[model samples]
Target: LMSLDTALNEMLSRVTPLTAQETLPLVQCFGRILASDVVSPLDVPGFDNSAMNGYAVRLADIASGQPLPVAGKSFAGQPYHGEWPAGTCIRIMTGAPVPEGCEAVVMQEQTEQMDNGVRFTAEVRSGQNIRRRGEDISAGAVVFPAGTRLTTAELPVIASLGIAEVPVIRKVRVALFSTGDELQLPGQPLGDGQIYDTNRLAVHLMLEQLGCEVINLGIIRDDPHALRAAFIEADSQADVVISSGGVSVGEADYTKTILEELGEIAFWKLAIKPGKPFAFGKLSNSWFCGLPGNPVSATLTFYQLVQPLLAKLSGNTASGLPARQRVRTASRLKKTPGRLDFQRGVLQRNADGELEVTTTGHQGSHIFSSFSLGNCFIVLERDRGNVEVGEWVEVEPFNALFG
Candidate 1:
């Protein structure tokens, strides 16, 4: 059995990122990966502006403790250009450009309004309450590098730089399907041994969430001819082809034989619980990932292995997996010694305000509800035994996939 790290590393090392690029409008660039660095065309804020609504004054002008008449007013997008008499101040609102030669801004709360002028009622400091131009981002600075995934946090910053369009990598095209003879679609009456095909729907939703242009091929049966056609069609149309089921050891499994005939595929028994039987390799024109038949196992494998592969293929340089943290286990966890266990867990802050995790009941692979009941995976080592209550265990929280 291959370890998870070795399997993932081998897959990532063998495949190269797609180089297709497109220039998209800034509003349409969210969730797209940058193809090149975005340089700021103008300074953030563009000018020295008031950080507060108050009186803008020079340090020497406010020293006399006498009332100073307002010379002019500066609103956002309007600068105070009137002649500034030596003993006067400018009334400025937040985000308004500070008048020329102004050294400080006293917030309105720190000033008293008299009949003729505004009086300074608090201690003043030079260069206070003034936002300098380019303080947040300088002109000509690289705001986002190549391979950066644009999100809500990044889009606004790019917009603030006056960028209307951006060069981004094209979205990955993924062809997805599932294989089984006993699988039936939902809303259809099930036969004696048939069950609803859940993996395909789950995989499709995840692919969409990862920003892949999914060409869903639906469910393929356990026939040699049908499976062969599906494989060939999927490979021809997608950058990556993903299928669940038929990679495991089953008497009726025709997917393995057809895949071997069509492409160089590796059927791997991964050293992980629930999602052990996984297949990954290259087809004639696309990469392939074969997930397990069980819904939970398929979801786990896609989250751990396939998600990173898609990120790499789509030119996203960000890490696909969430960071793991160590916390005390509030519930005893069951595990075997051979495979690394990703037991579904409910992580919560206890009454003492410390993070602790508890199991989401049964850890069976077929128990798909465990995923909905849990927020994180209580990761246990391959050789570790049953965990006792209060024991420290590593936990990996679910990313936006489970959100």
Candidate 2:
């Protein structure tokens, strides 16, 4: 029986980052990590731009009831090219290029249009409402370094830099499957001793959320020959091959046999609770993870044990699953110390703004109902026997995986 920490260390040692690299247009680089530093080709805005729709003026001359004459119209993409006359103001809109001779702008909200034009409610401050050239980014600035995850806000930064191409980590191509005679795909009628096949879908979507290009090999029944063909097909087509529910010691569990025939086991039977059947290996030309049959067990092993391996192989810099954090519990929790348990729980912020978790009905490894609704896992150590209400415990919230 290995402690969760030791098991994770072993899993990490079994996998490392792939050397594969890829390039994509900025349009498809969303959520992809940069393989190389993204340098700005030019300064953002490329010139001094207006930050507001107002009058750009020199603030030196000041007198009450003195209305300055309109200098010229400076709309966006059109600048007042020549020069500015003293005691005059240039009318400009947001994003319009500021000319060489103006020092400040007055926002439209602070001024009134009248018979004379451009009267400020108060004296304009020097440099007010003026966005300077290179204020957002300078030419040759590194907008994003290698391994920076491109988020929604980061898109504009690249767009502002005028870069249409980017080098990124190659998207992992995964071929996944589930094998068991007792398995039935959803929407199909369940026969005697048969249950709906939900784990394959779970595996597919999880890999997809991890930013992989997954090719579903679908379900394989408990037949060694069928499993062999499936493995060959997946190995020929993907960078990784994975199957759940067929890696155990049961007589009909043919994953171990097929894996041995087609490739080599990277590791087997990790001493972790809930999923001792968990197996990792290399198949022909790809990595393989044989997750357990039980739903919760599969998820736990995949998140804690398999995610890091995939991260490394996919060229991700994180190298591990997102870290867990301590969270207060709204109810009692139970576990043992030797192994880690990702107990499914509903978490919420209390009125006091503190994190709180409540275990759903049962923590059984087969209970998919409770696991599906979890926003956070009330994680407990293997030797942690019992916990009462209002105690702080570690938790992994739904950020990337479920969010």
Candidate 3:
């Protein structure tokens, strides 16, 4: 059995970032990975400007107690190009370009209005409240480095550089399905020994949340022919194919058999609870991930093992899965710890502003009812035993996977 971290790294080592790229409008580029570094064409401000609605003046000119005559006014988009005298100040608005001779600005609140001139009640400091050109973002600097994942904060920076479009990697395509004769779709009558096909839908939700384009192959029966056909089509068309079930040591579990016939298996089992029987390998042109049949196991494996691997194969830098954060336990937790346990729990902030968590009841791999009641997993280390009340434990919160 391999450690969780080692297993994930070994699985990701076989992936290569996609080289395809496309130009997209800025608005549509959010959540996409940058295929190349973004260079600024000009300074963010482009020119020296006023930081506030104030009176712009030279420090030497403000030394005189007498009111300085108003030379002119500078509004944004309308520059005052007239001559500024030695003892005169310009009435400027926020974001307006500083006048030719002005070196500093005094806020409007610090100035008084008179019939013939403006009075400055506060002392002026050199370089005060004046936004220098190229101070925020210089010309030709990289606004965003290659492999950067675009987010809302990047929108303003890209737009400020006057860039209308950007180049980003194409989204990863995933083919997914469930395989078992006992599986049934929702809204249909369940026969003897048959259960609804909920794992496929859960897998779909996780993949879609990661921004991958999914090619759902639907449910295939226990027959060898049906499984073989699905694998062949998925291998040729998708970057990755995920199947829920048929990876264990059961007689009818043909997933491993088909994987060996079409490609090579990377590894079979790992030392992680709920998803110990996980499988990873590669087909002709697509990677293969076989998840456990239980709903909790399938969902956990996707977050812990598959998510980071998929992110890397999609041409973005692999960020890795979220690490466990330490928090206090509100109730005692039971565990034997032969393998690391991601015990689902309800995490909340106590009235004292301290992090607190409580288990959501049974931690069985087949328990799907408790997932909605839990917002994070009380992650217990392997070989570490039971946790007492008020003990510090590590937790991995449910982020984009269930947020």
Candidate 4:
């Protein structure tokens, strides 16, 4: 069996990323990877504006206790343009541009309204309550680098720069399917020996969430001819072809034989619990990832392996996986010495305000509910024995797929 990192590195190093690019409107660019660096065409805030609703005044003008008559009012998108005489102030609302001679703004709560004008009731300081132009982002700044993924966190900032459109990497085309004679789709009458096909639906949902244009080919039977046709069609249309089941060393698995004739695929028994049998390599026209038939194993392999492959193929620079954190285990964990265990776990803050993880129970590959009940994977090293309570374990939190 190959180590997980070795297999991942081998796959990532051999494949070349897609080079297609397209320009999309800001609203449609969410989840797309940036094709080029987004430089700021103009400064943020455009002009010096008030950060508070109050009186815009020169420091020296507010030193005297006498009330300063309001020269003019400045509202957002409307500036005070009239001449400003001495001993006068401009009534300014938040986000309003400060008048030419104004150095600071006193919030309304800090000033008293008198019959003559507004009176300062607080100590005045220069440059107070004023948001200078380019304070948040300067002109010609690189707002986002090439290969950045544009999401909610990034789109609003780009919109604030008045950008209506952006250049981004085209969405990856993924062809997906599952193979097995005993598998049936949901909402169908299950025969005596047949079971519902869970891997295909799970893989399809995850593909959609990752922003890939999925071409679902449904379930293929165990027949060699039917599996061959599906593989050929998938290779011709997609940048990546993902198939669940038929990768393991089973007598009914024709995926290996068919792939050998049509592509250079490597079947690997990964040193990871729940997900061990994985296949990856190149086809005549696209890449292929054959996942294990088990639902949890398929999902785990897809999350740990294929997610990064898609990110790389789509030109996204981010590592799709979240960082692992070390925390104390509240529950004992089961494991063997041969494979790296990613036991489903519920991570929570204990009464002492420290992170602790507990098992979701039954870390079997077929226990799909474990994923739903847990928020993270309690990762135990390969060569480690069964864990006891209060032991420190590395936990990897689930990403948006589980969110």
Q: Which candidate number has the best TM-score?
A: 3
lDDT string for model 4 (1-403, tens) is 6898888889888877776899999999988989999999988789999999999998788778789998889999778899888988989999999999778889999998898988888898879999999988899999999999898999999998888999998899999998777888878888888889888888899999999999999988778899889989999999999987654433334566888888887778899987788888889999999888778888899988998888788888886457999999899888899899988899999888999999998888757888889999888999899899998899999888997
Displacement of the residue 178 alpha carbon in candidate 2, Å: 2.8
The lDDT of model 1 is 0.87
Task: Please provide, for model 3 over 278-326, each residue's C-alpha lDDT reduced to its tens digit, 9 standing for 90 to 100.
Answer: 7787789989888888788888888788888878887777475676788
Off by over 4 Å in 2: 13-25, 50-68, 91-95, 103-130, 185-192, 249-257, 266-273, 318-320, 400-403
**Residue pairs with clashing backbones, model 3:** none
Put down candidate 1 lDDT per residue, 306-379, tens digits, no spaces. Answer: 98888888888886567999999989998889999989899999888999999999898757878889999998
Over 86-179, each residue of candidate 2 has an lDDT whose tens digit, in order, gives 7667889899988776778888788777677567787677788887777777888888878777878877678767677778888888888887
Arranged by TM-score with the best first, the candidates are 3, 1, 4, 2
Among all windows of 10 consecutive residues in model 3, the one with the lowest summed lDDT is: 245-254
Instruction: Estimate the lDDT of model 3.
Output: 0.84
Candidates' TM-scores?
0.90, 0.81, 0.93, 0.89
Off by over 4 Å in 1: 59-67, 103-129, 247-254
lDDT of each: 0.87, 0.75, 0.84, 0.87
Candidate 3: regions farther than 4 A off: 63-65, 114-116, 121-126, 247-254
Error of 2 at 4 (Å): 3.1
Clashes of each: 0, 10, 0, 0
Candidate 4: residue 387 Cα off by (Å): 0.7
